[PDB]
Design a protein around this ligand. Sequence first.
Ligand code: ADP
Ligand code: ADP
Ligand code: ADP
Ligand code: ADP
Lengths: 443, 434, 146, 439, 434
Amino acid sequence: TQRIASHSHVKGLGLDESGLAKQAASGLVGQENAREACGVIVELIKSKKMAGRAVLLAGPPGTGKTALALAIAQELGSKVPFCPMVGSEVYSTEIKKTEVLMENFRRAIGLRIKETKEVYEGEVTELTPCETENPMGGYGKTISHVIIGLKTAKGTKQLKLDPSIFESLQKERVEAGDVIYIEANSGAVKRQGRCDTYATEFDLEAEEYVPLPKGDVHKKKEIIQDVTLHDLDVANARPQGGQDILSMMGQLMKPKKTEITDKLRGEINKVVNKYIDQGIAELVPGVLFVDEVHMLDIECFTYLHRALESSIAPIVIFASNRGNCVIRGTEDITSPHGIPLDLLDRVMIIRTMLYTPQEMKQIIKIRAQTEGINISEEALNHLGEIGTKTTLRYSVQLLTPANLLAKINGKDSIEKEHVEEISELFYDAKSSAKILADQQDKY
Amino acid sequence: TQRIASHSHVKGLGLDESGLAKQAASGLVGQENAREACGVIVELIKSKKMAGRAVLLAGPPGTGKTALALAIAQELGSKVPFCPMVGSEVYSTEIKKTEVLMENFRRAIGLRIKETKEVYEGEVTELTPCGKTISHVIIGLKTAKGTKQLKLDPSIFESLQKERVEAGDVIYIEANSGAVKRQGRCDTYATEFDLEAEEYVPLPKGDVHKKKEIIQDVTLHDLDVANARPQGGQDILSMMGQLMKPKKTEITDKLRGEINKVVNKYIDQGIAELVPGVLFVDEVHMLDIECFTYLHRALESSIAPIVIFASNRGNCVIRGTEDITSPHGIPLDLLDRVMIIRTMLYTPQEMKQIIKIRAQTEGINISEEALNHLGEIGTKTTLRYSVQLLTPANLLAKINGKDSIEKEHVEEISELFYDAKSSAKILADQQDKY
Amino acid sequence: FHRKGINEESCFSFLRFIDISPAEMANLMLQGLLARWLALFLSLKASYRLHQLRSWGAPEGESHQRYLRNKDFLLGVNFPLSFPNLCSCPLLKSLVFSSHCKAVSGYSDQVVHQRRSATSSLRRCLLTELPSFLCVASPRVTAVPL
Amino acid sequence: DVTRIERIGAHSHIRGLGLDDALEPRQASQGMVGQLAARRAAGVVLEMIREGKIAGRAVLIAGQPGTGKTAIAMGMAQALGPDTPFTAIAGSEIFSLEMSKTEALTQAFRRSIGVRIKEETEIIEGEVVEIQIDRPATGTGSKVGKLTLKTTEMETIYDLGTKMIESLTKDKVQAGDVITIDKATGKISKLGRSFTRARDYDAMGSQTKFVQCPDGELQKRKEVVHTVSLHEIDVINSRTQGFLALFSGDTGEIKSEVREQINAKVAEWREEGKAEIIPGVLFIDEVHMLDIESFSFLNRALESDMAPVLIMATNRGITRIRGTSYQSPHGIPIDLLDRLLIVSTTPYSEKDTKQILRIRCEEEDVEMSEDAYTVLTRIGLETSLRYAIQLITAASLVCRKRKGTEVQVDDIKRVYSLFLDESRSTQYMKEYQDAFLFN
Amino acid sequence: DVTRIERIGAHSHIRGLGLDDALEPRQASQGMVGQLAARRAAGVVLEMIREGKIAGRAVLIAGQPGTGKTAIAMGMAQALGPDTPFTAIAGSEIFSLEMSKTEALTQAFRRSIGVRIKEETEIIEGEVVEIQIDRPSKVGKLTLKTTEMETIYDLGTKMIESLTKDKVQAGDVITIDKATGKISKLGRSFTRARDYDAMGSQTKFVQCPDGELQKRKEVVHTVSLHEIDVINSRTQGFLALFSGDTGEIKSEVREQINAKVAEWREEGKAEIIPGVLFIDEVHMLDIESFSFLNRALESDMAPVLIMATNRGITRIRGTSYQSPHGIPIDLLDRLLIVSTTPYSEKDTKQILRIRCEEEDVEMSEDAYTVLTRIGLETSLRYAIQLITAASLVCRKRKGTEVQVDDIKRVYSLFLDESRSTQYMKEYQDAFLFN
Ligand SMILES: Nc1ncnc2c1ncn2[C@@H]1O[C@H](COP(=O)(O)OP(=O)(O)O)[C@@H](O)[C@H]1O
Ligand SMILES: Nc1ncnc2c1ncn2[C@@H]1O[C@H](COP(=O)(O)OP(=O)(O)O)[C@@H](O)[C@H]1O
Ligand SMILES: Nc1ncnc2c1ncn2[C@@H]1O[C@H](COP(=O)(O)OP(=O)(O)O)[C@@H](O)[C@H]1O
Ligand SMILES: Nc1ncnc2c1ncn2[C@@H]1O[C@H](COP(=O)(O)OP(=O)(O)O)[C@@H](O)[C@H]1O
């Protein structure tokens, strides 16, 4: 069974047809205005019109700003890319920060392109170079084509192939008893190995045998693949070929990220524009979620400045939980959320408030039920009171150890004694800080 | 012969049978409490039972801490591995700071493998090759003490063929390693041509068959480095070692565990034995706070050697914090783990004894009056000053034609060279001019 | 293989799920760059076979919906843009244009003038080769390797 | 319905500077309104750059936040044209771990001076009828063949040497294909298979798209125009067969001798009349972020005869320069500040803010009532213009949610209540002093 | 006599966590004394780890120095035992020069998640005796030999070619996997170790395989997720597993690994076993790295983090802010602090006894009393270290039982922090830098 995470219950915002926020739906309670704003943002993302618009979820720690981003991701679906990030990913020892940011920005934009695969594959039986019976002046014969018999688990059939393919057949080891495959579009031939049927004619053979193919000899299907715009960058930056001393040399050396030049993007954009205009590929913009933005640098913010007004950048959702803090990279330039004011004028701020005890108890119950835990009301109320005394996280965290203690005692549900014992055992931040202050002389 | 350094005059701790300290022995005088307490450490290292245990030496500069540590190193002989290092050596440009500490910790533990050295050498008389093409090759060695025949597997024959060795060359072979070294054609064929590019050597005057008993030492870190990255497998005749420049890298823990398991297996088979060596650190106060913290985990491990730390600075700020001051520049957390030995200062009698011992060690004859003057001048400023002063006096005394050392030579040298205090006082008066 | 318990941690397990033999790995680790080069070449020859095996044969299980087969830790080919898939699909070949052996500037419109009726046709974005003459630089001095 | 890679950004409505033939700015033209003096100065510098005779000229644009400095930059970039190189670099796009700051600035400078080359070649576009290959038995590896080409009017037969045959085999060209042959270099570009020749076919050995037959004469002439920056010429000539560094960006700290060699060779190329050198424009935005060493390198690098017309941008006041402790205007030392002309911008008013909102709505295809416009302008005067611009899309979405067609004051008030401003967020922020982190 | 690579350390006298069936700690069991509430919490979180149902859980252990946070962590690791990954690192180990602090933590997270897989293995292994081929598709046969049977295989042409290229000779012990057909030479038999008197470059002598020849069975493989990441990092990435050359693995590979692992667990082919990540001395991590743990503990697959901290209310490293435990508040709420308590006099006697029997040392009752008094007036670790020296000093006296005089002598020889600091201030001028 899939293991329980810390945000497993969040399945959506839980909105009406009119956009109003339900009191409790899809694992979310409260924060009605925030949920309505997030629904508006979801509509904006689905609109496929804007670009580079940013929203900043601002609120105290443990108020659900991280959860709402995942709710937006869930309500978006899975056909639109959603790239998470923390503020500490920019600091790399291999490449500059504004390239980490540019690569991530290009990650949140995905493609979706369709194509057909056609192949003739199966076991080879005989090779008949069918001749035309009347050689030409100055020659003893005139081979017309090659007849190749291929059999799979369905049936056997003969195919007429160009004579030149024989020149490729001798390039590899094409003997009867092997299984081969030829790409219809490409036209090359490749050998997989001898069939399993002849796996017993010897006691020790150096080659490994593959099973006989099941299905029709000639397969043809249609496949749609999705690639982000960053994958094209890496593919074009590092050509993966083997017939070079450069390709192979780089493929032997330690791979390192390289600062992609803006000229490469200028041509990838042109080619994807051409193919979109030809109706082959469909572009789908996505979302990029930066949590703990307050860990960025002033250089990173100043690059984000220019990055946002681009006509290609995706929708960015920032999250932070800092008060009036000093901006990283400066000396004493304080600012709200640790974010410069000039950048902060380009974002739409969504405020997240605290949680009332009723909503806290509802959250505790939802977590307990999603987790597969049974709790009594006289203990659930005590747990909610304890959480309201300290915080929501400290109340939700004690669910599992209480269940383990009850199961050790044999009971199938948590009572008052289990909760009080667990609370007596573990400590919270406030009491630990009080102890540290009391015993400061011995640390 | 051997060049004389500043620590060449110390041979051991000079402890008697009862464990106390003699007044003067093996080149050490004074420091009775510190010297005697080092014998306990010496016995601890020999026991090969405890691990991790550490020792700090605290005292003013120029009081014999490094001398005591080197005396401890001498007391263990050359069998016990000894890894000296300076705290300033941690800051490298290839690996992280804790990696150097781990590598030195591995270096401070050694192995021990006994084996027999097998040596063949002499002129090749014939090469006769023998599921039928090649199985083994018969070779005939001959010197001017006898003749022998040998049977070679195809690997050794390939090694001989690589050296372009034909019939009539002087060859050196080691059976244990499989080494093949061609030492040139024999002199008897020197007349075969008037001008030949080859060089000719006389027939060896010695045994064809040589047996010896050789004992090999190898530390764990050698195994880690050898097995960490693909061994070059290039010893010439290859341009592929000309592509990648070797660089020091960070050894993973999976490798180290595999090496530990293999070493346990082989020492259980009885082939090799293990010896816990000693690591020694100078300028430990120069370690960063990160290294001081990593020493908390490293020292408590069960496969760690015994470590000795030396530091002379006082209540100075710990590096990497610029706010916190701790004794000896060592954090209280780590300073609680170590076991501390204090080092005192030297009275004038010990001053004179040290000067006399250094003079007789480094090859200078000194008179009693000059010795008294040097003792007084050493009590004036420092101990190292007089030892430094010794040599120029005996270098001028040779110029004047004399042999011993008297008042005029030492007085002239003192008037010719300045110590730290006098130069500092000079710099103060000319402050605006420097 | 010879462990002291039914469940005991042992390294080199990945050798079983990669095509590397216990002798091939020792050779690759103690021979040198020639061995590494040959192994690399063999892996780029086996990549196409592994691609097809992973992409077109998914019947039930290998052992009736349990166990793992050879070359199951090599997931680098499952990507939609890896070279085997890129060669199988002829259009991603055109979407990856930066060849390692030609000098491609990018995309630029081309004009093809005719000789009769002076009709000029205009083309859309096409791959463009940088003009050869650009390369004119040369080092001041050359030295035989020491 | 289809969505291209280019979407509607923050400066997607500005199509130019909106100036007449007399270089007199209009009140409202080409998406730009107001800011008459700055637009005038920008038009002057645009005409100056278009003339392209003097080098190493710098211009700084200063003013309040959100007053159109970047808007002016994008406007002059659009007015300049696509064929004139323009490079936009942020203030932090030079602090790299792969090359020094001076090297990055040198690359940025050399990336702006373009070279235009017209390349005319003789080509043969035609349909393949049959191909003749006569492999030798033993001999010495000499191959001989023929190749017949046909169009709807004329056809011919060509002989083949020992060089194009290997190319034809490598490209695997067979009958029924339409190919373009480059007579100069010798490359074979594949167009596609024909229609009539596809009737006689074996099993599938080539499955792709379809094309027609090139009409007219078999031999024609093709022309390409290449715009190559100096920096990529430097990268090309810095190593043998090194071309992925144009895209990979792996070349670091190129040797100077290559740079002077390229400068000289470009000089001779200009003299011979083969290629044409055209200076471009470099736009460094938020340039207060540059370290003092970068500014001082700019000092000397701006005095060369190949420097571009760099344009600065700053919204700071009397601030200490990055990396130092000395105050100075615009966070720039006086040395660099004394070598360029400074253009200042004025804060906006109500009358032109309303027109900004109107043109933004026209770009975004959003309709509001006049009362809604007045409320939005009041918001965009009590609060910055960017917030009012942003609220337009949210109001349009909210209006479309209720199946509406015209945005109303109630929708705008709802959006104002839903989202937040920096001032209101800070006001609500003061009441949770102990709830936040590190106050 | 024979010493293995591991010996008596500081935390080697504890074997598991002393508990009951009802998770009730004992007063003295499995080498643990006291810390009843801390051990109860440790047992609860150990059961939480063993169940492995919830992901992303953090527990912090805080207390004064010398109270046993690291001892509790090691006892938990021993009680959990093998077969469950347990990655123990120090705080300062992530400050690398080839990877950022993010990668050095991401890899430390992926290295505590185990994957169990089952494989069907058929292997033949034995000593070759004779190889016969004919020259007519060459046809031949080869003979294997073990302790039980002696058999002949009629191998095919490709096997002929492989054997010829590998140069197999009689007396070699070889293994072949019939599924693939790869020869893995292991060396030569002991009985075949005399026909050559000059062995080649590299040869090994191993005993002949015993038992049945062609063994077919099922094996279980426990591989960490970090290994699966590194393997797909580059073309030949398994070298980086031991070399440590891996750096900044692309994020488009780890997601694919996670998706494939989820697909495998859905199919039942492989099973995921969570583990523990112990980060000792976490009080010295970067504010940038602390913020990374915020989103690292909210993933579907993540181990349980256990941290230790010796700091009270102190400055956070990387910022000028005062916080408890040197940890930001936005992370401390995600954790679950488990506090410790200084030991009493009875706990001090009961803890020195365990170490005495661990070191095989017999101590007197008055000696225990004096040692307990010293370890109460001073640090506990100093008193713990005071027993190893005492044994050696008593051995020098040629006595089998220590006494009070020996303890007093060892106390007088070495110094603790308090006396070292006190004597340090007496002549602080002689020291350097304050
Ligand atoms: N609206 C909500 N409904 C249900 N649970 C919530 C809600 N908001 C927060 N939580 C719970 O609070 C816990 C921590 O919230 P989080 O998103 O980490 O807050 P922050 O982002 O401020 O740190 C999560 O485990 C989540 O389950
Ligand atoms: N007790 C001693 N006996 C013999 N030599 C000594 C003694 N103390 C110091 N020395 C000599 O003094 C010299 C320098 O002292 P050293 O131990 O290097 O000082 P520090 O401990 O500050 O490094 C050494 O060459 C050493 O021989
Ligand atoms: N004169 C103008 N004409 C049209 N739009 C303008 C004008 N001035 C400002 N704007 C609009 O204001 C928005 C913010 O301006 P911005 O580029 O941030 O100014 P600055 O870069 O000086 O802060 C831009 O999206 C732009 O469309
Ligand atoms: N509960 C315990 N039972 C037995 N020995 C302990 C216990 N706690 C600590 N110790 C011992 O005390 C010594 C020092 O404790 P340590 O774990 O270093 O303290 P801290 O947790 O402050 O680092 C260790 O060698 C350990 O073996």
